[PDB]
């Protein structure tokens, strides 16, 4: 199924620094 997301399994760490930055900005 990740082939329909252009193999997000390689980039997901860049996505998770998003999910930690977006989330600190939700507590700020």
Swiss-Prot record:
Residues bearing PTM N6-acetyllysine: 14
Modified-residue entries (Phosphothreonine), positions: 7, 12-13
Modified residues (Phosphoserine): 1, 8-9
Sequence positions bearing N-acetylserine: 1
Modified sites of kind N6-succinyllysine: 14
TM region positions: none
Protein's name according to its UniProt entry: Thymosin alpha-1
Taxonomic source organism: Homo sapiens
Designated gene of the protein: PTMA
First and last residues shown, out of full length: 2 to 29 of 111
């Amino acid at each position: 199924s990740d082939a329909a997301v252009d193999t997000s399994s390689e980039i997901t760490t860049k996505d998770l620094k998003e999910k930690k930055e977006v989330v600190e900005e939700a507590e700020n």
